[PDB]
C-alpha cells in the first residue's frame, strides 16, 4: 500500500497507521508503544477494535445504514 | 448555550405579557386532567392581572413609536417608559440614574409630550 | 430500487421494538405471535413505513 | 421585565403517541422540560406558547423513538442587575420584607428601607418612623430597585434577591408623589 511491500505483523500493517488503541491490543509490548503516544496525541474514533470496546456499533454492518420516516401514520 | 442557537428576542412589558398568559390559560380546556395550571405561573398571572394600566395593542404601538422620537432611545428603554408612566423630571432621575446619557429638562418633556396622549386621566 | 440483506434485517428490527413499546399494530392480529413475527408479516405486504436514506 | 423568544430544539416524541398529529405531540413534550426551571444563564422560562415549524424524523440504534427539530416560541423573565422595577410587600419580617416582583420576590433589609431610623413594630405587622409618622405595612405598593441577586439552584424556590430603597423617588406611590415638590 505504500510503495514498498510491509510485513503483517508487529513491525508492519498493525504497527503502522491506525487508532493509538487499536496497537494496545496487539503486539504485546505495550510499554514501548503505548507510552510512545502518551506525548502529544490524539485519537479519534472509527477502528472496529475501538467501538466494541467502549459500547458502540461498530461502522461494519448493520450499523451503516441510516433510517428517516415521517409521522401522521394512518393505520387505514 | 440552550438548544442550538438562540437567533431572536424581544421586549415584552407587564400589559402585552398579560395577554400571553391568558391565551396559554384558554387551553386547558382539555379536560383528561383538567389541567390546572402550576403555582408559580398563577403567581406570575396575578402580577399582570392588578397592574395591567394600558390596552394591550395601543403599548405595542407606543413602543414603534418611541424609537424614532430619539436615537438614543432603544427598545429596551422604550418598554421600560411605558410601564412607569412618568410625568416630570422626578422619574427621568431614577431610571437614567446608571445610564450613559443624563437628559436634558428640553429632551425629557419631549417625552412627556408624546405620553400627554393614552392617559387614564383617573 | 430493491433492498440489500442489511437494510432488510434493520428494518425488521426497529418495528419489532416500536410494535412492542405501543404504535398500534395494522392488521397483523391471530391469536399470539411474538413481535418479530409480527414485523415479517407487516413486512410481506409492503405496507412498512420506514424508508432508507442512501447516501450518495 | 418580561421577554418573547424563538428557540430551536430537538423534540423526542415517545411511541406511545405515535399516532398523533406532528405539530402539538411536539408541542407536549417539549413543554413538559422547561417550564419553570431558572437557569443562571438566562433566567425562569415561563410556558411554551405555540410550534410553527417541523423536521423529520430520524431513528437511532437502541431506543425506538423519534428524533425531530422543531421551532416554538418561549416566554422567559430575566431579573437583570439594576434594573428598576415595581413590586407588592406580600411578607412580613422581623428582620426584612419580601417584594413580589412577578414570579420571584425580593427582599429589602429594614435599614435600605427609607431615610429614616426604622423600628420594626414586634406586636403588628408595621414599621413606624421616628420622626415623620409614615407607616409601612401589608399590601403597600412599592417602587425599588435590584442592588444583589444570589443564585444558587436550578430551582425558582431557592433564589432570593436583594433590593433597596435608599435612593430620592423611590418606595411607596403616594410617598413619591409627595416628593415631587
Known sequence: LDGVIRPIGRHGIVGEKASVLARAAFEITTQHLFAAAERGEVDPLNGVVENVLIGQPVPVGTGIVKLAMSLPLRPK | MIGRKKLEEHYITIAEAKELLERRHAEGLAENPEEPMFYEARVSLEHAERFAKLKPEQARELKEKLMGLFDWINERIAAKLVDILPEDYLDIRVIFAKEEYMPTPEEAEEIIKVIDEYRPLE | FRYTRFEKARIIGARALQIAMGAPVLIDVPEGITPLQAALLEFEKGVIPITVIRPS | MYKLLKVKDVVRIPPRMFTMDPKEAAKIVLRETYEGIYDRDEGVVLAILDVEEISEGVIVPGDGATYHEAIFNVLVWE?????????????????????????????????????????????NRQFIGKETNRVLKLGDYVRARIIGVSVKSRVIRENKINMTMRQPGLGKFEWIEKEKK
Open chain 4, 79 to 123: 431579573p437583570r442587575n439594576q434594573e428598576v422595577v415595581e413590586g407588592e410587600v406580600v411578607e412580613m419580617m422581623p428582620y426584612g420584607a419580601f417584594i413580589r416582583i412577578g414570579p420571584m420576590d425580593g427582599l429589602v433589609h429594614i435599614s435600605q428601607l427609607m431615610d429614616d431610623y426604622v423600628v420594626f413594630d414586634e406586636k
